[PDB]
Motif scaffolding. Structure first.
Motif, mmCIF file in Angstrom:
data_model
loop_
_atom_site.group_PDB
_atom_site.id
_atom_site.type_symbol
_atom_site.label_atom_id
_atom_site.label_comp_id
_atom_site.label_asym_id
_atom_site.label_seq_id
_atom_site.Cartn_x
_atom_site.Cartn_y
_atom_site.Cartn_z
ATOM 1 N N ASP A 38 5.727 2.287 -2.492
ATOM 2 C CA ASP A 38 5.713 1.891 -3.902
ATOM 3 C C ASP A 38 6.034 0.414 -3.975
ATOM 4 N N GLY A 45 -4.267 -11.829 -18.709
ATOM 5 C CA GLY A 45 -3.153 -11.096 -18.138
ATOM 6 C C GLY A 45 -2.850 -11.554 -16.730
ATOM 7 N N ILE A 57 -9.795 -13.293 -8.727
ATOM 8 C CA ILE A 57 -8.477 -13.168 -8.116
ATOM 9 C C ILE A 57 -8.205 -11.748 -7.614
ATOM 10 N N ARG A 84 -10.974 -7.729 -1.374
ATOM 11 C CA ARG A 84 -9.789 -6.881 -1.453
ATOM 12 C C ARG A 84 -10.505 -5.587 -1.130
ATOM 13 N N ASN A 104 -10.119 -10.848 -4.426
ATOM 14 C CA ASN A 104 -9.885 -11.742 -3.299
ATOM 15 C C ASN A 104 -11.163 -12.491 -2.941
ATOM 16 N N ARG A 122 -3.649 -3.994 -13.149
ATOM 17 C CA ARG A 122 -3.074 -5.229 -12.626
ATOM 18 C C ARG A 122 -2.800 -6.357 -13.630
ATOM 19 N N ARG A 179 -0.891 -13.492 -14.009
ATOM 20 C CA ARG A 179 0.534 -13.795 -13.874
ATOM 21 C C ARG A 179 0.909 -15.244 -13.984
ATOM 22 N N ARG A 219 -4.467 1.581 7.386
ATOM 23 C CA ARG A 219 -3.691 2.464 6.519
ATOM 24 C C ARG A 219 -3.350 3.807 7.156
#
Ligand SMILES: NC(=O)c1ccc[n+]([C@@H]2O[C@H](COP(=O)([O-])OP(=O)(O)OC[C@H]3O[C@@H](n4cnc5c(N)ncnc54)[C@H](O)[C@@H]3O)[C@@H](O)[C@H]2O)c1
Ligand SMILES: NC(=O)c1ccc[n+]([C@@H]2O[C@H](COP(=O)([O-])OP(=O)(O)OC[C@H]3O[C@@H](n4cnc5c(N)ncnc54)[C@H](O)[C@@H]3O)[C@@H](O)[C@H]2O)c1
Ligand SMILES: NC(=O)c1ccc[n+]([C@@H]2O[C@H](COP(=O)([O-])OP(=O)(O)OC[C@H]3O[C@@H](n4cnc5c(N)ncnc54)[C@H](O)[C@@H]3O)[C@@H](O)[C@H]2O)c1
Ligand SMILES: NC(=O)c1ccc[n+]([C@@H]2O[C@H](COP(=O)([O-])OP(=O)(O)OC[C@H]3O[C@@H](n4cnc5c(N)ncnc54)[C@H](O)[C@@H]3O)[C@@H](O)[C@H]2O)c1
Ligand SMILES: NC(=O)c1ccc[n+]([C@@H]2O[C@H](COP(=O)([O-])OP(=O)(O)OC[C@H]3O[C@@H](n4cnc5c(N)ncnc54)[C@H](O)[C@@H]3O)[C@@H](O)[C@H]2O)c1
Ligand SMILES: NC(=O)c1ccc[n+]([C@@H]2O[C@H](COP(=O)([O-])OP(=O)(O)OC[C@H]3O[C@@H](n4cnc5c(N)ncnc54)[C@H](O)[C@@H]3O)[C@@H](O)[C@H]2O)c1
Lengths: 551, 551, 551
Positions: free
Chosen positions: C222, A170, A457, A520, A460, A534, A172, C462
């Motif tokens: 979003d 999946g 991925i 990440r 990260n 994702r 991209r 954040r």
């Protein structure tokens, strides 16, 4: 934009799936036939058209044409019948196409960097329309499957591989980049051909070659990120091991031929043990071959052993290798290289001059065929294992089938169904005389690379350690059910390479995070939900604009 | 622009032909294999590929894929082997493709107007991405050659037709518009096929149908002009004639099925007269068939006759017709239509019940096979003619070959090499017992329409009179050299349809101006230079921006 | 692309700066005057032009026209004369422009969300052409500085604000998004103006208003992310505070009107303490005003105090406030709000009816003018302070100059050069009878927000806590060199707001990481290198494609 360009773009073209409203609103009306089709109907159309097709090559040309025209439909199609379409778009057939590349050629597919381009690789890289690239697959075409050096025709490989990164994991499509580095070709056949699509020169082996790879590595990260996943493919043993080491800790890289192989293999051996719960100290593995595949598998096997309580040395002592010059033994006339020495032990009193001898002298509990030279796992070798061990673990990984060390039927019958078998090439269920039916598993690399790529991925991650593949191997084997393991299946059905791949990615991300290899950081609590969320879907996106009144 | 878009546009895309300079300066360096090829090497590769091709449909699918990726190369190839490719792209193979449409379908290629879009045809028409359209070919797919009513699958006809407008005449492809009107289909194989790409309804034949053709006619000239060439094709007898009558004086239109047929045929006869010089009044022509093609060639013969000193009534009396119901006689039970009437003469004393009898009772000096029903030119009818005439003119036009009334060998052998022969389908030389080689010619429309369309386009003509076709016929026949006639050829070699088409263009333009039918008025003195100067070439254009210093 | 489009895009357009090479190779040769200019000559021309300009609004119209034609040049110019241009582009002139909006209006510059588009804010938001937005500045235009409620004309504020984010901090302009929410306007001059560009309705203040702000908040994160910096501006006291409270912990947001004010102010005081070193507990601060700005600076003072050993109750007791209704006393008839309460102490024995009396009854060592009502720091109040304190701290912040509580000369002269002075509006040196030159500093927000926005953006923070502002205040004050303080400057020269803004960035990032507030985790070792390495430069980029031979 609107109109025709909307159709000339595969990332947007929905073909006859454009609704009436969309056709009208987007300036397509009249440009397409009078029938509006759904994604389901289009897939049904291709399935039929492909169904009544002969060769795998024509099936390849036709399906890849669907990708250059409609990327969404293409992945829907390939995901709807992935088990059979995978070997067409990739695994075995892609290699047939890499041979006809230039003859079958119809439209370029990735990024071509030639040695003639040295000093200007970033300019070529900057020509890649995609800005957010996450997964790169590189090859220099030097070693394509069993085809050898195919030069720039090797590009067919990264292309097909990336097709699976997406179809199974999946990942991209727009973030994937297939690359082929053309430094020349040693294949005289190609060089003579006036329709050859590459540099008419012999493979450059000078320092320029090394500098060019450096440049390309730098150029890719400079534009896309230090953490951009770069996977080498079909590079040629010496370069594949040295570049892997040279960059693994500098960039986010890995070579699937060495590590993906190592992990699929290990995953099998792990499912076997789940059957014959025998002291890991009670294991001795014999390799038919001592090349790329053999070395990667040994190394990862040893790591599985060590992590279980054995010294590095102890683990390696239980591993022997037999190549075309016989048993890799200390001092032998045939030469041994760095990666081989750890497995080059002291000669037995009886130095075998035959694998069958070795099988008798060394008495290994497990046999692994990675010689790629036909059925060298003779009925003598086979029955000599079923006699030595109660449950022989036999692995014939050499592909294509014609190259395997033996068939599944051979293994099963010759062992009265007491062997744990697995092969690189597919074999149907072996129903013996007593009624027993053994469904053998195929250790395909696709079980591993897609889920590992996504996990790296999404986290990260900037460096991939071998430990990730052991983790990967473990994650694959954990998927096998009781019944599956009860029928000789050392691998989960390829028919679910999708959820298996996600599950693998999920487990691997959990690993990256727990071992501080992930970056990440607002770290997900539910790594499952995280990964699942994702994944790119092949569903068509509606193109209509939000039109509403106004009070 | 530059970059990928340049490669995704067939009009601009030059594939491996883009030079290093162009690639670098245009942002393509890296997106193409590191090899520079010429249009010659390109053509050469696809040619060799196509030679090693089995089935023609394959050949069609292959070559039509080149046209959708690189227009220049496509026409280059198409023109490099015009005689062998024309039948693939059009003439006969194209009809096979129309039956396949929906199965072979890769990418849309023309403009689709459906009876559903009535009232909104201009909108659809405005969606056509080209702004300066000079040549439109329309079809409602009601009568594709022998296949019958193939609904929207008929689109393949206008597409192939137009490929030839460009290939033979040099009419710019970007100014060509393939159109297909879908008003329903009567074909039940289609209405039931779930993958059919048109309207699932029976052919509309109410006022809406007529209204929609008007709308389309007005919508097309509204946007592109009143002098826009609109050619009808495979419409179905009743409509083709009536619509031909209805607009010939309102728009710039013609029907190749009716008019182009009458001209190649008639041009064959004219060629024959180069051998049989007797007075026109001494001619008697018998037609096997009384349909669209019989009425087309007949009426044009009448005009050539009338223009040669015959009253129109006499001209008409020199022609006879024998449909399925027997000789077209005055009073026959079998109904006769308004168009046959002028050729439905009073019954002779001996009314044949057979064409052999007819050949006898009327002793025509010329026979034309246009019944599309197999060999009706029986070996007896053949000989009958060879005994009635020293050099009988036998024209077996029914296609495909299986519907031809007789063959080259047949006719030549049964006449001792006295007959002058021509056929719709191709036949190779007919070597005789005496070593006399007889190469027949083929009466393909591709001889007339290309050169006639270009003449009308370049002269800004607004209406096409039958006199224009009479002129095309005479222009074509004048292409015949002594030698080719000395070989039995009643037409010039299809091998050089290009120059034959240009020369016909120069001829018809000269006639158009001379007869005040042309409107591009700063009238050229050298019409030859004028035509040749405006033909579209397949040569690749230089895309390199002009870079230079400033002194 | 190339050609005109390249020139019509301010991001790419380089005007006469495109080199001959670029023009030729890019398809611009001929579309530009035959002269090649540098960004230096360009800046020089527009500078000279702007020098010879009379009115500031003109200057604003002029310079904002450069930004819409050539972004690089615009920021180059803006940065070439930062101190003199900042007030034109933003600070004070911008407010004049907002009153003119609709009259001066040339081209739209931000994203407009109207209460009419409720339920469809995401659609609007998706229309924004930029995909990687890092900094948003929102305003509903309810309170533009002193001008009050200017409806959608408030857009000019977020626009000018952002120009500075880029000009001082180096925040990439393509990642900036000026937003204006139109929920109606109360301004009757507007409701009646026929050329007004917003909704002709009174400000909505129902649930829909609150609902729309939420929608906007969710719609923005979003699409761009939850860490997207969203800064509120000129919202109107009640909303600015409550919305600040409502989202500060939900999103990455802050209110420069409240928080940035509290930091520059407080940073002035900190600067003063470099002179008046007495214990913090010995401080007493009296505020002329009790509004948004008084409550902002107060609360941040409390925190600096609390963090310095004072209880929170004591800290609060060292502050006093005098609004229009007189001293903020416990029980006063004049209503007191939840935010003033903590500073509404019990009435002293002698309750002043005047600020001079107050200054007497409380004898504060520090006075801050934030009432926006002209010179309320009467020459008597001034002297009163100079007699109560050796070096009184007088802060006249009300703007514009006409609303300032007193002037540089005033304060300095009436104190003999003992007072430490700062003001909202600018004042030049105050030379005294003894030749002592006193250069006051200006407490402009532009000191804090640029460097703070960049720190938060680069750290993927954040949420923004007041502690972050306390840190900005301390980071700014640390920029002050001995000399500038030796001159009366309580802030660094606005002339070098760039480096002052970067240095504040490096400081705040260090604090964010150190306090686990940053999320860009492969954490830099050299935060300085990290920040400086990511600032956007105004230098033109080379647009020349790489052309080279192939050895
Ligand atoms: N997932 C999988 O199923 C998978 C993955 C990787 C590789 N493989 C297979 O492994 C095989 C070998 O691949 P590789 O990359 O290791 O190749 P390689 O060329 O690096 O090594 C091949 C080894 O086999 C030995 N060998 C060759 N002929 C022999 C013979 N006749 N008798 C004894 N030994 C012989 C050679 O000495 C050599 O050491 C291939 O057939 C390949 O298809 C399968
Ligand atoms: N804490 C949170 O959950 C959080 C925080 C901020 C933003 N967001 C959301 O995430 C989006 C932007 O974040 P992001 O793009 O970094 O995603 P991400 O952080 O969820 O993904 C992490 C990495 O995986 C990559 N990735 C994700 N899917 C991929 C795919 N299918 N194929 C290949 N690569 C893939 C991304 O490029 C990224 O580098 C925004 O829409 C925002 O709404 C979530
Ligand atoms: N350029 C060319 O070579 C060319 C051009 C046009 C048409 N044609 C050929 O002419 C044939 C007919 O074309 P059309 O459009 O006029 O068809 P049509 O259907 O309009 O007319 C066919 C006529 O043949 C008659 N017929 C049928 N069977 C007969 C039989 N068994 N015996 C005697 N008469 C019979 C019918 O009565 C009818 O009048 C086709 O096969 C076509 O291939 C050739
Ligand atoms: N007196 C002259 O010789 C003269 C006068 C004016 C302009 N020109 C030249 O003619 C060019 C533009 O004029 P034009 O396009 O009207 O040409 P044109 O007037 O010579 O052509 C007449 C018509 O034929 C069409 N046409 C020409 N070639 C065609 C082709 N190959 N395929 C399809 N349609 C074709 C044109 O669209 C036009 O409607 C200019 O570049 C100019 O240099 C020549
Ligand atoms: N960085 C800066 O220099 C900076 C920043 C923010 C605000 N300011 C200035 O502060 C002033 C007020 O800003 P705000 O947003 O807090 O306003 P506000 O309307 O929220 O509050 C103004 C306060 O002053 C009081 N007041 C009015 N007239 C008074 C009078 N005649 N005597 C005593 N008290 C009186 C009011 O009661 C009210 O409490 C403005 O003029 C503004 O220019 C300067
Ligand atoms: N460890 C490292 O130093 C490292 C690691 C990976 C990638 N990279 C490089 O970083 C580049 C892309 O990464 P990134 O964009 O996420 O950078 P980043 O991670 O360094 O920046 C962090 C955040 O600040 C934002 N940002 C940076 N400069 C900005 C500016 N001037 N104005 C407004 N927002 C700004 C970014 O969008 C990002 O969200 C690549 O070209 C790659 O070469 C460096």
């Amino acid at each position: 934009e609107k109109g025709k360009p909307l159709m000339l773009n595969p990332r947007t073209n929905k073909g006859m799936a454009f609704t009436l409203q969309e056709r009208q609103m987007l300036g397509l009306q009249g440009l397409l036939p009078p029938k509006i089709e759904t994604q389901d109907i289009q897939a049904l159309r291709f399935h039929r058209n492909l169904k009544k097709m002969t060769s795998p090559l024509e099936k390849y040309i036709y399906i890849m044409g669907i990708q250059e025209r409609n990327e969404k439909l293409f992945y829907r199609i390939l995901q709807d019948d992935i088990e059979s379409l995978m070997p067409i778009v990739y695994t075995p057939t892609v290699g047939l196409a890499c041979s006809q590349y230039g003859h079958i050629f119809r439209r370029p597919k990735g990024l071509f960097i030639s040695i003639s381009d040295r000093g200007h690789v970033r300019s070529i890289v900057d020509n890649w329309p995609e800005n957010h690239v996450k997964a790169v697959v590189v090859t220099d075409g030097e070693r394509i499957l069993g085809l050898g050096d195919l030069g720039v025709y090797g590009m067919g490989i990264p292309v097909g591989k990336l097709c699976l990164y997406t179809a199974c994991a999946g990942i991209r499509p727009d973030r994937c980049l297939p690359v082929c580095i053309d430094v020349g070709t040693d294949n005289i056949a190609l060089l003579k051909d006036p329709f050859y699509m590459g540099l008419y020169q012999k493979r450059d082996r000078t320092q320029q070659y090394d500098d060019l790879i450096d440049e390309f590595m730098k150029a890719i990260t400079d534009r896309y990120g230090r953490n951009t996943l770069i996977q080498f493919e079909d590079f040629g043993n010496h370069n594949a091991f040295r570049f892997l080491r040279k960059y693994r800790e500098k960039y986010c890289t890995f070579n699937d031929d060495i590590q993906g192989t190592a992990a699929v293999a290990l995953a099998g051996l792990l499912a076997a043990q789940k059957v014959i719960s025998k002291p890991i100290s009670e294991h001795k593995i014999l390799f038919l071959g001592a090349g790329e595949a053999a070395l990667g598998i040994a190394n990862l096997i040893v790591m599985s052993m060590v992590e279980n309580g054995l010294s590095e040395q102890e683990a390696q002592k239980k591993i022997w290798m037999f190549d075309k010059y016989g048993l890799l033994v200390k001092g032998r006339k045939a030469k041994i290289d760095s990666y081989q020495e750890p497995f080059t032990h002291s000669a037995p009193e009886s130095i075998p001059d035959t694998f069958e001898d070795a099988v008798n002298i060394l008495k290994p509990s497990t046999i692994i065929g990675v010689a790629g030279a036909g059925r060298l796992f003779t009925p003598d070798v086979i029955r000599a294992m079923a006699s030595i061990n109660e449950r022989p673990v036999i692995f014939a990984l050499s592909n294509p089938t014609a190259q395997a060390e033996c068939t599944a039927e051979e293994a099963y019958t010759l062992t009265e169904g007491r062997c744990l078998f697995a092969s690189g090439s597919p074999f149907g269920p072996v129903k013996l005389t007593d009624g027993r039916v053994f469904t053998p598993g195929q250790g395909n690399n696709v079980y591993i690379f897609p889920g590992v790529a996504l996990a790296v991925i999404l986290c990260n991650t900037r460096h991939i350690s071998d430990s990730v593949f052991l983790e990967a191997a473990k994650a694959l084997t954990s998927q096998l059910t009781d019944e599956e393991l009860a029928q000789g299946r050392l691998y989960p059905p390829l028919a679910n390479i999708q959820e298996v791949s996600i599950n693998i990615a999920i487990k691997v991300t959990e690993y990256l995070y727990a071992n501080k290899m992930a970056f990440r950081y607002p770290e997900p609590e539910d790594k499952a939900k995280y990964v699942k969320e994702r994944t790119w879907r092949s569903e068509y996106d509606s193109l209509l604009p939000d039109v509403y009144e106004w009070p």
